[model samples]
Target: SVIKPDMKIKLRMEGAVNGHPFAIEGVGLGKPFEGKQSMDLKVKEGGPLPFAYDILTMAFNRVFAKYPENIVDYFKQSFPEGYSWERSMIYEDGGICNATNDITLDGDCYIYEIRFDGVNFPANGPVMQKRTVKWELSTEKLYVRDGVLKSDGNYALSLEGGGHYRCDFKTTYKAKKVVQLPDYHSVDHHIEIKSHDKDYSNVNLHEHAEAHS
Candidate 1:
């Protein structure tokens, strides 16, 4: 299992931009067992653009803790397929139940959209059904942006289920690039070279076999 049932995962992102520092945090629960997961996230005020910061906060809250079983192995196996990733996530009262990350390249920008869809679950109570978080960034530019950030792209979330959901929050900014790559790449490359053999227990092997078959 990528995350054991008893394990509680907490992640904190703290850094500075042009001598200014900022921080964000989140908590979540779930396993990569093709099932439901939940997360709680928050972003601290100050430091950089509002729109991008809000998007980061929201997207991380939505799916930060969820992971696929043997996540490393899954990424290694899935990256070739345009690096797309998808898995189930259960929302309140068994309402929302799926999530996916679709990545595409347009010119110098990498556009990533995280989508949520409705699915059946044993009846419980009120809950949300669908939502989306879209992000676009360029390695050449080193700044993140969306509809709110640049007015050229989009950064909106839509939700539909038992109740009406509506909101609007936006802003834009130009801050120094503190990190050139995503967090996963910042860690020592050798860390990724470790064994996936231990991650391939019988259950995981069978599951992967079925997926390939």
Candidate 2:
């Protein structure tokens, strides 16, 4: 089995006209100044987490203001297994981005939506050059068979669209042997990013992790 004690991941959102060419906006800086933004992200459970096999929804809580009371519960049960947020980042006048986003199930292909509250739009508001946009989570799991990476139970929601946005996030975790040792089970995870949202690509960010010794 392979083992690497470092984890760096990026979460981003973008709007596009075609499938190949697109513009990005959100945290987890992808294309830096050329049009990608960043935001500081952290692990909710505060650990290395059993990324290889543990379910991401093992830790999730929803809280919000000015929205329907059941909206949070609706999403919580919607996935019941993927992942969720602590605060409903969706706002009324739009300056949200507080924590109003999460990933849920959509058949087998998980559908990511950008449900915003018409807040802090870029003057043009969230529009569709195409009926759908592609949201990508940053990772390099091509070398593994299954999703070969795991998030440390934390995320940062950037303003990806104009209304209350809920974009789909692809979760990947590194593969490991089902060892019978309990000593080597966790790690200290701390990752960070800049602001959130821009309109470009081709960039890199930094993340940090320290597993059980």
Candidate 3:
């Protein structure tokens, strides 16, 4: 019921880590940042996409780069569908934060990885101490005929990793099934067949009724 590589959908993510909020929505920013860092994400139609995480990784990286003070960075530590990212942060002094750096996605895909470790506070505020990391997303339905998952949810905090001063994390995405309307087209063939000279009594009442209508 789903798939065949052009059935695409925009992505939107919302969450926070180390108590800082972050998210991604439909592409609306002015052009990309001179690289593969655009917010516009489209799922490639085919079998289950295996690059869901990479997509998230790119989007997150783009968002984090906006802040020169505190920021979280991601690096891929795995591959395929089941993997994680190496988390890093740059809150107050990015020296130690720079120590960690690294991470990637596709669509049926929803993975939320939001975090910031060694994050620089707003003008050196509450940052880089007892920081919490997190990653979460949810929603569902018994999708059958449609073939694609038709629901949206939010990814809550995920760390469960206790630390001091700032936090960071990574997540991945994969879709087993998706609903896609098949590629369609129509064929039109026109022809006309009518009675030229026929006896009405022999044609019966059916013909007469149809012609009258």
lDDT of each: 0.28, 0.25, 0.24
TM-score-sorted candidate list, best first: 1, 3, 2
Residue pairs clashing in model 1 are: 147-153, 147-154
* Stretches of model 1 off by over 4 angstroms after superposition: 1-7, 16-20, 45-49, 54-213
Candidate 2 lDDT tens digits, 1-213: 011121112332322221222222222322211222223333322122211101111111111101122222221233324443322233232423322235443333222232222124233433221111322232211112232322222222234453232322223322122211111123333323322223212222333332332
lDDT minimum window of 10 residues, candidate 3: 204-213
- The estimated TM-scores of all candidates read 0.27, 0.22, 0.24
In every candidate, how many clashes are there?
2, 27, 33
Question: Relative to the unseen true structure, what is the C-alpha lDDT of residue 75 in candidate 2, on a scale of 0 to 100?
Answer: 18
Q: Give the CA lDDT, 0 to 100, for residue 42 in model 1.
A: 45
Question: Largest TM-score belongs to which candidate?
Answer: 1
Residue 64 of model 2 has an lDDT of: 10
Q: Tell me model 2's lDDT, rounded to 2 decimals.
A: 0.25
| Residue 133 error, candidate 1, Å | 6.8
Give the candidates in order of lDDT, highest first: 1, 2, 3
